[PDB]
Amino acid sequence: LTWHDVLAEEKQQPYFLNTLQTVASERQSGVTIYPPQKDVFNAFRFTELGDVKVVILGQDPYHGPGQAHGLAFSVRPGIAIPPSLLNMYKELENTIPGFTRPNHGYLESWARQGVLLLNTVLTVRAGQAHSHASLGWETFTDKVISLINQHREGVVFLLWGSHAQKKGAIIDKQRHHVLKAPQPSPLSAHRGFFGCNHFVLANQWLEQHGETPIDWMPVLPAESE
């Protein structure tokens, strides 16, 4: 089973097609929408259903130029590491042996290892956080989480913030492994995100089950000749 097998019907629902046509409208209305259209579903491109090991939810895509590219918390090479990802890195530096501060914020190499970096809302108007939160994306990502719960076994869910935790309440905590903490943004990171140790705990779960742990040091695409 692939995403398109299990999502094909959802993607023909009127709410879903209407979300897309509203985004397409907004893109030509005089405001800029992030991320670009070709990138909205990149979490699914980079992490197939059968390849999901760890799910990390974000909420809103970053809303500044060059930031969002379809993966929760990640930014394009060359862009400064946003505060939420810096705080994730701080927790990583404090817990994973050998980890040091990366010089970039790009997390493709996490996704290609099975880390599903799923925002619950998949578009945003430039500079206007949460501006697409009532468009239909939350219904869609509700279904996505429900389908992972149903169709996979032994996935690690890192649920950061009340919003993500609410969304993951339906997950079977016997069949899957659910870990909770506050969000890594500056408002709450020092109130429980630091010290959550989620990255080490996720890897110990995977190892428990004969899966390769995640190499959390993210890697920049290489140059070629």
UniProtKB/Swiss-Prot annotation:
Question: Key word Kinase present in the record?
Answer: no
- Name the residues annotated as catalytic in the UniProt entry: 60 (proton acceptor)
Q: List the catalysed reactions.
A: Hydrolyzes single-stranded DNA or mismatched double-stranded DNA and polynucleotides, releasing free uracil
Principal location listed in the UniProt entry: cytoplasm
Q: Its Enzyme Commission number?
A: 3.2.2.27
Alphabetical keyword list: Cytoplasm, DNA damage, DNA repair, Hydrolase
Where found?
Cytoplasm
Residue ranges spanning the membrane: these are none
Q: What class of enzyme is it?
A: hydrolase
UniProt GO cellular component terms? cytoplasm
An example molecular function term from Gene Ontology annotations: uracil DNA N-glycosylase activity
Name the CDD domains on file: UDG-F1-like (cd10027)
Show the Gene3D superfamilies listed in the entry.
Answer: Uracil-DNA glycosylase-like domain
Q: How does it assemble?
A: Monomer.
Biological role stated in the UniProt entry: Excises uracil residues from the DNA which can arise as a result of misincorporation of dUMP residues by DNA polymerase or due to deamination of cytosine.
Known HAMAP family for this protein?
UDG
PANTHER family named in the record: URACIL-DNA GLYCOSYLASE
The entry's protein name is: Uracil-DNA glycosylase
Which species is this UniProt entry from? Escherichia coli (strain K12)
